[PDB]
Amino acid sequence: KYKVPKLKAIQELTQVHGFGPRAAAALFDREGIFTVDELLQKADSIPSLTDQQRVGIKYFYDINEKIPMQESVLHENYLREKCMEVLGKDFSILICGSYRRRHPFSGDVDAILSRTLDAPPLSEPVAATGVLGHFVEFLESLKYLEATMAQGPLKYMGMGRLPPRINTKVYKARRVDIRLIETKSVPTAMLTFTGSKNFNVIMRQAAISKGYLLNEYGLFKLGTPEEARALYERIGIRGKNAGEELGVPKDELEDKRVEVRSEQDVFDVLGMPYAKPENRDP
DNA sequence: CAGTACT
DNA sequence: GGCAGTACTG
Ligand code: NA
């Protein structure tokens, strides 16, 4: 990632959702598959593919159809309406991603679900109440969500299709991600999930250089690299994260939180000039 | 875990 | 020698 026959096949096959270099090489080696179209053709007869991979394959065409800005507006409205219906006024939905950066086309619908600033406090992480699952099930019963790639208490990834509009128009299925985020974490999650990816990396490096940890959950003042390392020793998890569980920082990391109300707060604390979403494509 | 995904 | 950071799958 830093530097950035069998190789060319890997380059082909990793276009498919669920397939990385490892699954690709196994397709090549075990199955003798060189191209996407061979994989599409053989998929059903390779018993070892995951359910998620089978979704990536079955929806290959849809996934690679870009979403026009105007359809994203409809997805946003729809998600907000359904959120209001089944979750009520305590909850809100915001669509981020390249759409919020105002690109004419996007590759998916990237949503944040969170409690409003006015909602009563909870005594538990919001992801422990099972609200993401309730919301997902609601959207499935409506046939908006029609296939799941992966779902946990914090994050849903799947396929969503707007219902037909009346001549009648049938919509394409679209990649939909939904993340359940604590209220105080909204501005940092908006930053993260609006991106771009390179933008986030640059800002996280700026945070590191000033002795902060920046992630979607918050901005945390760590101090020296050694104080940071000492902290990571205590609560940091090798292949997982710096110390959150169910979207809530562990106490010792929470103690380091610098509260923010807005994206602007984060730029300011890091000594960076504000950039509007549409100017976050470095 | 190791793979894969996401911004 | 470490790098941006974190979620779900099996
Ligand atoms: Na892929």
Give nearest nucleotide to A229 (CA–C1'): C2
Angstrom distances, CA of residue A87 to CA of A30, A83, A91, A262: 47, 5, 6, 24
Burial status of residue A203 (CB atoms within 10 A of its CB: 0-12, 13-18, 19 or more) = buried
**C-alpha of residue A254 to centroid of ligand 1, in Å:** 35
**C-alpha of residue A14 to centroid of ligand 1, in Å:** 4
Per DSSP, A257 falls in state B
Q: Which chain C positions come under 7 Å from a protein C-beta?
A: 3-10
- In which element (H, E) is residue A217 found? none
User: SS3 for A109?
Assistant: strand
> The CATH number of A182-282 is which of 1.10.1740.10, 3.40.190.10, 3.40.50.150, 3.30.210.10?
3.30.210.10
Half-sphere exposure of A161 (CA within 13 A, CB side): 17
Give nearest nucleotide to A192 (CA–C1'): B7
Neighbours of A148 (CB within 10 A): 15
Name the CA radius of gyration of chain A, rounded. 21
Neighbours of A225 (CB within 10 A): 10
Residues closing a segment before a gap in chain A (C–N exceeding 2.5 Å): 4, 166
**C-alpha of residue A46 to centroid of ligand 1, in Å:** 18
DSSP letters for A142-203:
TTSEEEEEEE-SSEEEEEE-PPPB---BPPPPEEEEEEE--GGGHHHHHHHHH--HHHHHHH
To the nearest 10 degrees (0 to 180), the angle between helices A186-194 and A197-209 is: 130
Q: Round to whole Å and give the CA distance between A125 and A181.
A: 9
Nearest to A90 by CA among A127, A124, A115: A115
Contact A17, A176 (CB under 8 A): no
Angstrom distances, CA of residue A23 to CA of A4, A12, A141, A150, A247: 20, 12, 33, 17, 30
Please work out, in degrees rounded to the nearest 5, the angle formed at the alpha carbon of residue A266 by the alpha carbons of A116 and A269.
135
Q: What is the spatial distance, in angstroms and rounded to an integer, between the CA atom of A228 and the C1' atom of B5?
A: 27
Give nearest nucleotide to A52 (CA–C1'): C9
Residues in Cβ contact with A214 at an 8 Å cutoff, skipping those fewer than 6 apart = A188, A203, A204, A207, A220, A266, A270
> The CATH number of A67-181 is which of 3.30.460.10, 3.40.220.10, 2.120.10.30, 1.20.140.10?
3.30.460.10
Residues in Cβ contact with A226 at an 8 Å cutoff, skipping those fewer than 6 apart = none
Annotated binding-site residue? A108:
yes
Q: What is the spatial distance, in angstroms and rounded to an integer, between the CA atom of A34 and the C1' atom of C7?
A: 30
**C-alpha of residue A124 to centroid of ligand 1, in Å:** 35
DSSP H helix total and E strand total for chain A: 13, 11
Contact A39, A16 (CB under 8 A): yes
Q: Residues 20-49 of A near strand B (Cβ < 7 Å)?
A: 20-24
Neighbours of A261 (CB within 10 A): 10
Residues in Cβ contact with A163 at an 8 Å cutoff, skipping those fewer than 6 apart = A142, A143, A144, A171
- In which element (H, E) is residue A136 found? helix A131-141
Q: Which two tokens stand for residue A90?
A: 């305590």
Contact A57, A16 (CB under 8 A): yes
Q: Which two tokens stand for residue A248?
A: 């809530």
What residues have their beta carbon closer than 5 A to ion ligand 1? A 14
Give nearest nucleotide to A148 (CA–C1'): C8
Contact A97, A45 (CB under 8 A): no
User: SS3 for A126?
Assistant: helix
Q: Round to whole Å and give the CA distance between A93 and A156.
A: 14
Angstrom distances, CA of residue A180 to CA of A54, A210, A277: 26, 29, 21
Resolution (A): 2.3
Nearest to A57 by CA among A71, A42, A40: A40
Which residue lies nearest C6, CA-to-C1' measured? A241
Contact A98, A107 (CB under 8 A): yes
